[PDB]
Design a protein around this ligand. Structure first.
Ligand SMILES: Nc1ncnc2c1ncn2[C@@H]1O[C@H](COP(=O)(O)OP(=O)(O)O)[C@@H](O)[C@H]1O
Ligand SMILES: Nc1ncnc2c1ncn2[C@@H]1O[C@H](COP(=O)(O)OP(=O)(O)O)[C@@H](O)[C@H]1O
Ligand SMILES: Nc1ncnc2c1ncn2[C@@H]1O[C@H](COP(=O)(O)OP(=O)(O)O)[C@@H](O)[C@H]1O
Ligand SMILES: [Mn+2]
Ligand SMILES: [Mn+2]
Ligand SMILES: [Mn+2]
Ligand SMILES: [Mn+2]
Ligand SMILES: [Mn+2]
Ligand SMILES: [Mn+2]
Lengths: 468, 468, 468
């Protein structure tokens, strides 16, 4: 409703409207217009902007594109000083007003459409669990003469020896020791709740909040699932709230997957399930309460895992979390117990809540593209009745080590994932959801990133080879 | 209305009246008088002041001149502590009360007059888009033993490694990475809006605001077009608001065109169109919805580009933005897509909004003189039916590089532009708008500036030649 | 003599041989081999080295080239710790052993050959007067956030206020006040003499040494002329001695033409004359004791001045010395008095010493290429009997200012000079001395340098336009 919006403008005495959207990498972008620029036209024809400015979008000749406000997304910004209303927008091709091939939100919408079209189900449910870190100081750089990164937080175990102005009060979570010590060891209760309250003021529904495993401020706010595209929207808002509440509290938050070697990384498990006319298409008589549809879905995810990685773990850093470790969600298998398996099956009573949990995604992932790729892989698993095989209930990557334990695994590097995405792109092009151009552009953006890391000497290389 | 003014004095309990005007370089100037000095005389005969004090104005013998308040410009100053009313003034020759040959506002008015006189149209529309930078620290100097410039801002990418008192919160726009990351990466939302609110309190109409491309605080406030002279007035107010809101927020703003090598410069694109009795003389059946009048106008701009440069890019620094780069608006051509072309043709639906966008101007330009020169070149393009030739839809300055790609280009240095202005002055003298004396004086002011830069050793020269 | 060399090896118990050569920019380069690697082969076939490593030389496919030792140049290095013999080398094309088109020494030799060939004379005489600066501290840099240059020397007038550890002894040359105050005002007597003694130990013949005009260590060592190519060799040695004696004394020397705005730059006047069978072809009955041949030579130099500039003033910095100043050697004219004229005619008694002094060259110039271009221009002046016109005995660039005083002048910027060289290249290609490829390569090297300076914001631009 465009009318609901015009009343929210008066009800909150809005002075500005902040138009938001996401780029290919997954980063929320914005531009602001005075409330008085919002008229009838605005909703039917949107506003014009330069495409060539966003990475991986229009090139030299076709710059101009359309910002189409989605009136359903209207929500007040809780941080800006002057009353302002946020309105998420889709990026449409001018004239045709179609929906840009490279617009991640359009792509996600297309994927929800294709779901309904195949008639396999009418709605997809996503419940991602993004984790994050809260620090006090983050410093880094790289130039010809070197490079570095320094992290600091009042909770960091390393500060047990630090001299502080008013004395070191020393109650800190040790390495891997953040799972639930009550305050003062946990220094983020008040902040986690503000994040919750604010998230809810912005339309999210919070289920829980807690400190995570790592020392130095790993935390998590769990929110209720929602339909795929609305959830990706929620992820963006979620990140926004986290980033800004942290900033307001004198901290700095990051959704990087592995900021520290030696302690937990941050993951973004994704719970999924399908539905039609209110019934859960994933409940059944098969394994752990699953439908055979769920199993085909799983099979799809497993078949296209490496390609999904390119979207669910889009950073070189992502692979520093996905390493032969014990709890590393790297084994392409399912189970209701074995937490070595990248696909957990939650054991729950109500068949209405039956679903699967794909564990390898990380918060760096573009909501839209990550969720979409997960769906398309699932659908292709169904359409082609791809059987999962049997569930792994044994053990992870280490011992096993019997048959060299070379069972399925997620990509081991970004390049590998990008290459998989290159080759295994058909399941994504299905229904015209992902175009080759979009995929090739995405890959090019990430290869440029992959190159920086591959080409820049690493501090550890000096430790290992300076005296060679 | 001089009566409207006398009521604004009582309504706002004004204690002072701040008389404003612009010098040849384009810098707003002012002098203040107590409100009680405002009487009937004031409006009909103005106030006297020393001409010899402003650069490039009256010399040794004819110092005294007149400040003529323009009652239509009355607006309250939003920063001064004591209630004060701003009134823009024109500079008139004493006795004759004509309008000083060297007064940029008089010159701009003369140009609007000449437009109506030729009967080509009755009003000119200007929609400039000045960009600017917001820093925290700016230091520079030059003496016999050296020189330097140091820029600093909390957003500067270089500060990713800086130690801060309360910790580095590190969410900064990388180089060329300022186009729209939401806060906290974008640290200027609150300030851009205050600038908007204040601009509107001062009569401007804001269309949008956003962070620009460069790291370290490049920003932009887009305002609605207006008739030529009123828009130049708006530019002055615009700059004033930007400069002062920044100052009040603990920042410092600059409209310099290229403060940093390696990242975006700041430009001031100028959208233009002509009109008569409410109809847009630029809409037609020709290319991209244009009238043949628009094309002649374009031809004029292209013919006199180098001379216009002397007013639209009046600083040596201006040419550090206009360099063989990809997006450099340096190719003297038009197109609706090719953003290599210094003249873009906005593709819009309503023929009421058809216009041209001359991209090479920068914010250092004198509003008045820059806009005027753009007009006069356009008119001369019409009067002499100067055809544009065909639109460039190929590519920019690099590859092309086929036929050495020596097509039209803007001046490559200030001196070159000044020289062009010298030789190609006829189109400006038309209608007696620009006098030779005015032009020669302007050129002399800028040559003195050009000399400082040409004569002072450049830091890079040491890098390049110290070991020669 | 290759035998004289083999005896110098034993006489001085040489452990190494330092092979030297010059690149296109004019910078001496070197590589060292143990004395035991010097055999008969060495002299007849030289040693192989990678061409692609030097700027502006061989490209992707034809890397390898020959270093041909010139046994006449053997001289002991006075600084190296272990006894080492320096041997200048020419760069020859492999197999053909011809002489690389781009080798500046080969080019200079070719030019001396062509002189003898035309039969105009059998030897060219060059007496350059390079000036230089001696500092204590030189700091500079340029990055995205700024740039700077800081000069410091115990003689700098600015240090009259500096606090020193053992007290400020304050006897310093004021600005433009360095011409001859005896010590202690002149702090470089001992160092200038060491430079002299060492220069002579290396084969140069010193005529005088003295402090120059500028504060902060401008100095000069005057050496006796010699035949063109041998003199360019001497220039290289000269610079080497200056640079290294300075280094050994705790100073740092520079041959940059204008390190400071506000005080003298450093020039390299070039005295020239031609000869055949021991007689001075420049003495005659014409003006000031000149032959008509000398006048044609002058005419040549004047005709091709702008192109010569590209070699005699090859840096952007060069043009900060050649600016409308009083003593600026920028007026393309001759005279025996008017020191406004870039060509002075020394008034001397013995007709054996009659010659011309071209004043605009600076020490940044490549010896070889600068001298060669001067010759070729002179010869073309002769071959085509280019008359000089009449001598200027009036005044310089300022008042005059009568007829706007637009008489001949040297290039006003590097680009202009490079462009002149581009267009006016025929006189250089004469005799196959300079090839188009060589010229185009040189121009490309310098344009890259010109670009750095044109594109990088200048500190003064902030002073002039930050508040725009
Ligand atoms: N179909 C579904 N029915 C019920 N809950 C679902 C469904 N699909 C996803 N979910 C999500 O399960 C997630 C919540 O619980 P959480 O305590 O964070 O689990 P875990 O211990 O695996 O991190 C939420 O995102 C929840 O909304
Ligand atoms: N004749 C005209 N009709 C409509 N708009 C015009 C006209 N002449 C100029 N304009 C100006 O176009 C400019 C605004 O839009 P903007 O989003 O900043 O474009 P761009 O993407 O080229 O920077 C304003 O200055 C607008 O008022
Ligand atoms: N043909 C020539 N006969 C005599 N001296 C010559 C000849 N050609 C060049 N010279 C040079 O004149 C220069 C020296 O004198 P100098 O005192 O430095 O003069 P100035 O006052 O012009 O700087 C030397 O380089 C000297 O050898
Ligand atoms: Mn968790
Ligand atoms: Mn989980
Ligand atoms: Mn802009
Ligand atoms: Mn624009
Ligand atoms: Mn001298
Ligand atoms: Mn001299």
């Amino acid at each position: 409703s465009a009318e609901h919006v015009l009343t929210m403008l008066n009800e909150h005495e809005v002075k500005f409207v902040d138009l938001r959207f996401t780029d290919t990498k997954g980063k929320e972008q914005h531009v602001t217009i005075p409330a008085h620029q919002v008229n009838a036209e605005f909703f039917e024809e949107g506003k014009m902007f330069d495409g060539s400015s966003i990475g991986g979008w229009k090139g030299i000749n076709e710059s101009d594109m359309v910002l189409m406000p989605d009136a359903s997304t209207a929500v007040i910004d809780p941080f800006f000083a002057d009353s302002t209303l946020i309105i998420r927008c889709d990026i449409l091709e001018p004239g045709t007003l179609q929906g840009y091939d490279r617009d991640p939100r359009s792509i996600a919408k297309r994927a929800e459409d294709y779901l309904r079209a195949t008639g396999i189900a009418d709605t997809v449910l996503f419940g991602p669990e993004p984790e994050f870190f809260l620090f006090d100081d983050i410093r880094f750089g790289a130039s010809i003469s070197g490079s570095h990164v320094a992290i600091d937080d009042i909770e960091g175990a390393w500060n047990s020896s630090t001299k502080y102005e008013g004395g070191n009060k020393g109650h800190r979570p040790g390495v891997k020791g953040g799972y639930f010590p009550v305050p003062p060891v946990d220094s983020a209760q008040d902040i986690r709740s503000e994040m919750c309250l604010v998230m809810e003021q912005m339309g999210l529904v919070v289920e829980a909040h807690h400190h995570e495993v790592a020392t130095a401020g790993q935390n998590e706010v769990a929110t209720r699932f929602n339909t795929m595209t609305k959830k990706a929207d929620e992820i963006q808002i979620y990140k926004y709230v986290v980033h800004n509440v942290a900033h307001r509290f004198g901290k700095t938050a990051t959704f990087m997957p592995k900021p520290m070697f030696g302690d937990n990384g941050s993951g973004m498990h994704c719970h999924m399930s399908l539905a039609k006319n209110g019934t859960n298409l994933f409940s059944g008589d098969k394994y752990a309460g699953l439908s055979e549809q769920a199993l085909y879905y799983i099979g799809g995810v497993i078949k296209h895992a490496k390609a999904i990685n390119a979207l669910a773990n889009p950073t070189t850093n992502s692979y520093k979390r996905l390493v032969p470790g014990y709890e590393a969600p790297v084994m392409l298998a399912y189970s209701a117990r074995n937490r070595s398996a990248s696909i957990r099956i939650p054991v729950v009573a109500s068949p209405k809540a039956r679903r699967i949990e794909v564990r390898f995604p990380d918060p760096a992932a573009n909501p839209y593209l990550c969720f979409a790729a997960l769906l398309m892989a699932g659908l292709d698993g169904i359409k082609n009745k791809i059987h999962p095989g049997e569930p792994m209930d044994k053990n992870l990557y280490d011992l096993p080590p019997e048959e060299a334990k070379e069972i399925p695994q997620v990509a081991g590097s970004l390049e590998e994932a990008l290459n998989a995405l290159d080759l295994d792109r058909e399941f994504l092009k299905a229904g015209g959801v992902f175009t080759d151009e979009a995929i090739d552009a995405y890959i090019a953006l990430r290869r440029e990133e992959d190159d920086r890391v591959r080409m820049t000497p690493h501090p550890v290389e000096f430790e290992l080879y300076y005296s060679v």
